[PDB]
UniProtKB/Swiss-Prot annotation, chain B:
Protein name: Spike protein S1
Domain of life assignment: Viruses
Source lineage: Viruses, Riboviria, Orthornavirae, Pisuviricota, Pisoniviricetes
Function: Attaches the virion to the cell membrane by interacting with host receptor, initiating the infection. The major receptor is host ACE2. When S2/S2' has been cleaved, binding to the receptor triggers direct fusion at the cell membrane. When S2/S2' has not been cleaved, binding to the receptor results in internalization of the virus by endocytosis using host TFRC and GRM2 and leading to fusion of the virion membrane with the host endosomal membrane. Alternatively, may use NRP1/NRP2 and integrin as entry receptors.
Effect of residue 21 to I: In strain: Omicron/XBB.1.5, Omicron/EG.5.1
Outcome, altering residue 24 to L: In strain: Omicron/BA.1
Result of altering residue 28 to F: In strain: Omicron/BA.1, Omicron/BA.2, Omicron/BA.2.12.1, Omicron/BA.2.75, Omicron/BA.4, Omicron/BA.5, Omicron/BQ.1.1, Omicron/XBB.1.5, Omicron/EG.5.1
Summary of subunit composition and partner proteins: Binds to host ACE2. RBD also interacts with the N-linked glycan on 'Asn-90' of ACE2. Cleavage of S generates a polybasic C-terminal sequence on S1 that binds to host Neuropilin-1 (NRP1) and Neuropilin-2 (NRP2) receptors. Interacts with host integrin alpha-5/beta-1 (ITGA5:ITGB1) and with ACE2 in complex with integrin alpha-5/beta-1 (ITGA5:ITGB1). May interact via cytoplasmic c-terminus with M protein. May interact (via N-terminus) with host bilirubin and biliverdin, thereby preventing antibody binding to the SARS-CoV-2 spike NTD via an allosteric mechanism.
């Protein structure tokens, strides 16, 4: 644990990137989190929503 | 069937042409939920029940 100050910065940046990548898996209230599924399932008036 | 004893049929292992159903003028009500009616031929389905 001698080099913990640099490893803390590395871990924080990697965890922020992992959270940003993980946020793509959330649908945020939509029917699906995948854009291609919505574009292949729905007409553009409701796929727009 | 009657509505209290509604019949359920499994649809599986076949190719479904929904363009001859949706373009038919025989059906007064055609309401699709969660899928567009014109996108039906472009999708493949599992566990189809009628």
């Amino acid at each position: 644990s001698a080099l913990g100050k640099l490893q803390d910065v590395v871990n924080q940046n990697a965890q922020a990137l992992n959270t940003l990548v993980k946020q793509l898996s959330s649908n945020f209230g939509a029917i699906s989190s995948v854009l291609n599924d919505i574009l292949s399932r729905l007409d553009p008036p409701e796929a727009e929503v | 069937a009657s509505v209290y004893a509604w019949n359920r049929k499994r649809i599986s292992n076949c190719v479904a042409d929904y363009s001859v159903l949706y373009n038919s003028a025989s059906f007064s009500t055609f309401k699709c939920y969660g899928v567009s009616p014109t996108k039906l031929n472009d999708l493949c389905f599992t566990n189809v029940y009628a």
